[PDB]
Design a protein around this ligand. Structure first.
Ligand SMILES: Nc1ncnc2c1ncn2[C@@H]1O[C@H](COP(=O)(O)OP(=O)(O)OP(=O)(O)O)[C@@H](O)[C@H]1O
Ligand SMILES: [Mg+2]
Lengths: 629, 379
């Protein structure tokens, strides 16, 4: 089994694997070093990754992108619209008040949850990796944005389980980048020496994250982390499209807002123009037939673009100032600023980040690969067959978390367990006096420290199997409270003590209620995914057998005319040409859309005769080589 | 300090560095793993790389590319004379040395080819330096196998101008072979053929390797293939479809053709990774929707002569090498068009099922090997 790290980006995903003595980037079927984070649907099969992207502009209504962003999203969330404006497909409320995508698929109307949809993509991307590696892949480490909620981390971990993978850790993405920084730099401070302070700024398609870390050889600690989940390349593309929407009403008397297909053509072209503007100071904007018969030809300067996003750039220093205040340091205390993510290539952003830190920017990581590589290293940390050079890291635990318990004979019924601005993972040991079975829960100590509309309760537990000793008053129960390496709040052990000596007596059974799915629900979703996989595979194999048939027709026809000519009688040649001709016409009729078996059958009729001629051709080839040697 | 490997390409360049037992291909500040060998001069500034290519059509007389075709050559070179007819920039004679002539900051300026290439090499140097975080001063640069002393020396001069210490000028197919580790097989003679097809240029090289020592046995350049000809076959095929279904001809419709063409270029690209591709052009002609598809096998058939013709330089190179196809030990694929399945098939069927070295990005395999060779020359 080979450790697999996944940078699951809103626009594209990077695949990395830990093998040989290192970590490699896995390349897809098109040879790309990232794969588009797209799940699309057709009448016959799903369009996942590259193919999803290829089909996207022709089936926008049934193509879901923004997969990351709808994970764990309340349908009536006050900020739903900032999410939904970037969707082209129909979004709907689910039975749990979350959001799914409604989609035409295989001739029916289908509703899928954000978890199901993200699972489809993880499954495709898993297949890329095992087709590249030839290996068994069973474990993943998925990198998510630090703003991911506890729920959202459980959701995406379940998505991996539906794709048949063990989500070994759900890691914060720029922590994963910082880990790859740490494992690759060879000159890190070593003893009593001051750690190296490195800020990491990641701006991608949708998010802007600043995370500040202390490095020594073999270790990092995250000091401060701040996010803007509404600051990304997609906001630039959108501001550019809205600008041209207005321009085209006056210039061409066309209204692209009333024409979703036209609008989408401009949106797509707007990203390419935005990228030109990271290199050049002016750029033409030219889109042919944005509607029927209408060619638009305009332009934009970098300075005009910067004006377009002025409202957004008002927030440009916030994640830096917030991450420094958290880290309890001033900008001057940072040694290096490392830049990753595609949107950090924008010159105004680069200047603003540099100016906010008072430092030049460093770019000593591959900006695209760093998160996936760190995630693959972290996945390796978890393999039982241990062969990684160790690296220790701690991540920041921004919020205070308490646990509560059926009071019973305790003077208190709750306590602060994991403080605001501590680290995870962390384990806290408590012992409680108990009169019998009891409930427990974890909650946010102060809900005002959390995002608007955050439920206070994180998880709850039913602890049972409590048995009182002879002196039937109370009994001490020892508990293990864990903020696990994903930052998830758990109870991982409970036992009765006091069986002259202390001793474990009864191991108590814990029933956990978390944001994670039931085994019953997990299996049902694993099932649906397996069915869609089988259907996709049948369609892909039948398309292949049919292209293989068509190719062989042309190939064997040309050979009979050339190198096979001396190796066939007139009756053999004309018989085979006849069936070649007939097989070609069949591909336009009944064979236009037949079944796997018939493409194979037709090929076998042809090849069975064709091979006889080939085997004569090959015999005289070898014979000429004995006349050689 | 690490040495770098640079593929100074005729159209694109690529830089790598060997670090921690592996070659890292370095992305430029726009995120691209290759950089256009373009240098633009404008009323205010000089632009190199992506910036230069991005504004070519708006500034064609002052955007220089193809300096690799001029470098180390005499002005009266029949190749120089021939090539000039294809460029929108001016090339002047200065002592029988070609110079590209240009408007720069409101003035008329001429540049030696090695001055244009040095600026590209400065760029690759800066890319390497930004990634490593320290000054880079040592480089292996690659040239084609057919380069003469003067072409080789002129390229080294461009390196020296860029501020590099040119550790070695090596052949591009040698670099590609080193990338795949084909120099590691010890004593005994191995015949390697490097098939380099992409960006409208085609080079077949046969090398002999023995104890890590390379000898150029044959070079064969069918110079022009891999572009608009395949596009035309697809365009003509679909123009026929429309003519058949709707009984109307779109041939003499300037805009409609460019539209159907754009669709065919897209479709072509899809067929390197899929066995079929859909075409869908809204109201293509006189309000009529053209939604169709093409299979990979059909595409290959339309272009079967254009594909088969790739084996000509293979067969030529073999003759100059005085080798039978059975005597080639190793195959290396470089250049973008070798991603095309039919190219890989033809080659493999021609060479009797022999395995192909193709796992390294065919655009990056030359910078890769140059970076390997740069680290060896420092160890
Ligand atoms: N040279 C460039 N100039 C400007 N923008 C760029 C450039 N290159 C890439 N981008 C933008 O960066 C974005 C892709 O970046 P990235 O891969 O960091 O995002 P992601 O990981 O998919 O998104 P997220 O992290 O928000 O989920 C796209 O919006 C793309 O347009
Ligand atoms: Mg990202």
């Amino acid at each position: 089994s080979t450790p697999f790290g996944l940078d699951l980006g809103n626009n594209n995903s990077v695949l990395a694997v830990a093998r040989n003595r290192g970590i490699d980037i896995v390349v897809n079927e098109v040879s790309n070093r990232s794969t588009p984070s797209v799940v699309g649907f057709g009448p016959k099969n799903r369009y996942l990754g590259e193919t999803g992207k290829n089909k996207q502009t022709s089936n926008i209504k049934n193509t879901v992108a923004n997969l990351k962003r709808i994970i764990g999203l309340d349908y009536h969330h006050p900020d739903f619209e900032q999410e939904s404006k970037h969707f082209t497909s129909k979004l709907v409320e689910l039975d749990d008040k979350k959001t799914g995508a409604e989609v035409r698929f295989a001739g029916e109307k289908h509703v899928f949850s954000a978890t199901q949809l993200a699972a489809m993509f993880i499954d495709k991307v898993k297949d890329t990796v095992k087709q590249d590696t030839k290996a068994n892949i069973t474990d993943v480490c998925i990198a998510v944005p630090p703003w991911y909620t506890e729920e959202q981390r459980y959701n995406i971990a379940d998505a991996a389980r539906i794709a048949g993978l063990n989500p070994v850790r759900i890691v914060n993405d720029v922590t994963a980048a910082g880990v790859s920084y740490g494992i690759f730099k060879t000159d890190l401070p070593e003893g009593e020496e001051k750690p190296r302070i490195v800020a990491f700024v990641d701006i991608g398609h949708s998010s802007y994250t600043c995370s500040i870390m202390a490095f020594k050889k073999g270790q990092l600690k995250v000091l401060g982390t701040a996010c803007d989940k509404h600051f990304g390349g997609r906001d630039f593309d959108l501001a550019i499209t809205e600008h041209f929407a207005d321009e085209f009403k006056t210039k061409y008397k066309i209204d692209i807002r009333e024409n979703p297909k036209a609008y989408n053509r401009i949106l797509t072209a707007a990203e390419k123009l935005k990228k030109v503007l990271s290199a050049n100071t002016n750029a033409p904007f030219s889109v042919e037939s944005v509607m029927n018969d209408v060619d638009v030809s305009s332009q934009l300067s970098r300075e005009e673009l910067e004006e377009l996003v002025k409202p957004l750039l008002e927030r440009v220093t916030e994640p830096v100032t917030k991450a420094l205040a958290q880290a309890k340091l001033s900008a001057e205390e940072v040694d290096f600023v490392e830049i990753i993510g595609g949107t950090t290539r924008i010159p105004t952003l680069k200047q603003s980040i540099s100016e906010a830190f008072g430092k030049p920017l460093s770019t000593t990581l591959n900006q695209d690969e760093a998160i996936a590589k760190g995630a693959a290293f972290i996945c390796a940390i978890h393999s039982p067959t241990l062969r990684v050079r160790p690296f220790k890291f701690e991540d920041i635990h921004p919020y205070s978390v308490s646990y509560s318990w059926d009071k019973q004979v305790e003077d208190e019924d709750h306590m602060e367990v994991f403080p605001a601005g501590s680290s995870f993972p962390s384990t806290k040991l408590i012992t409680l006096n108990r009169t019998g079975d009891f409930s427990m829960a974890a909650s946010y100590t102060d809900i005002t420290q959390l995002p608007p509309n955050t439920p206070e309760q994180i998880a709850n537990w039913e602890i049972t199997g409590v048995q009182l000793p002879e002196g039937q008053d109370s009994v001490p129960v020892k508990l293990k409270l864990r903020c696990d390496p994903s930052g998830l709040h758990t109870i991982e052990e409970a036992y009765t003590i006091e069986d002259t000596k202390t001793v474990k007596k009864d191991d108590l059974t814990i029933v956990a209620h978390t944001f994670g799915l039931d085994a019953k629900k997990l299996n049902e979703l694993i099932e649906k995914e397996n069915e869609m996989l089988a259907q996709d595979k049948l369609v892909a194999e039948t398309e292949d057998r049919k292209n293989t048939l068509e190719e062989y027709i042309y190939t064997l026809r040309g050979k009979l005319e050339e190198e096979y000519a001396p190796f066939a009688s007139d009756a053999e040649k004309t018989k085979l040409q006849g069936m070649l001709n007939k097989a070609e016409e069949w591909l336009y009729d009944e064979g236009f859309d037949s079944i796997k078996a018939k493409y194979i059958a037709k090929y076998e009729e042809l090849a069975s005769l064709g091979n006889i001629i080939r085997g004569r051709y090959l015999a005289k080839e070898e014979e000429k080589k004995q006349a050689i040697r | 300090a690490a040495a770098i490997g640079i593929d100074l390409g005729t159209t694109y360049s690529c830089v790598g560095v060997f670090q921690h037992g592996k070659v890292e291909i370095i992305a430029n500040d726009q995120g691209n793993r290759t950089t256009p060998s373009y240098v633009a001069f404008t009323d205010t500034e000089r632009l190199i790389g992506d910036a230069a290519k991005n504004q070519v059509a708006l500034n064609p007389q002052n955007t220089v590319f193809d300096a690799k075709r001029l470098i180390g050559r005499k002005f009266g070179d029949p190749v120089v004379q021939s090539d000039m007819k294809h460029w929108p920039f001016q090339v002047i004679n200065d002592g029988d040395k070609p110079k590209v002539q240009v408007s720069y900051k409101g003035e008329t300026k001429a540049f030696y080819p090695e001055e244009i290439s040095s600026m590209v090499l400065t760029k690759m140097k800066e890319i390497a330096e930004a990634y490593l975080g320290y000054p880079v001063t040592n480089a292996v640069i690659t040239v084609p196998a057919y380069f003469n002393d003067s072409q080789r020396q002129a390229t080294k001069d461009a390196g020296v101008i860029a501020g590099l210490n040119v550790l070695r000028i090596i052949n591009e197919p040698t670099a590609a072979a080193i990338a795949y580790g084909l120099d590691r097989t010890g004593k005994g003679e191995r015949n390697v053929l490097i098939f380099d097809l992409g960006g409208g240029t085609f080079d077949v090289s046969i090398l002999t390797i023995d104890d890590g020592i390379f000898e150029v046995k044959a070079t064969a350049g069918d110079t022009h293939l891999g572009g608009e000809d395949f596009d035309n076959r697809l365009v003509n095929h679909f123009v026929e479809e429309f003519k058949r279904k709707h009984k109307k001809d779109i041939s003499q419709n300037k805009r409609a053709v460019r539209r159907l063409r754009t669709a065919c270029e897209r479709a072509k690209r899809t067929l390197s990774s899929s066995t079929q591709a859909s075409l869908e052009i809204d109201s293509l002609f006189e309000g009529i929707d053209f939604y169709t598809s093409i299979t990979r096998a059909r595409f290959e058939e339309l272009c079967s002569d254009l594909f088969r013709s790739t084996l000509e330089p293979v067969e030529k190179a073999l003759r100059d090498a005085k080798l039978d196809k059975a005597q080639i030990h190793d195959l290396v694929l470089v250049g973008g068009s070798t991603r095309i399945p039919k190219v890989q098939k033809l080659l493999q069927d021609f060479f009797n099922g022999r395995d192909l070295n193709k796992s390294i990005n065919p655009d990056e395999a030359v910078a890769y090997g140059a970076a390997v060779q740069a680290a060896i020359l420092m160890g």
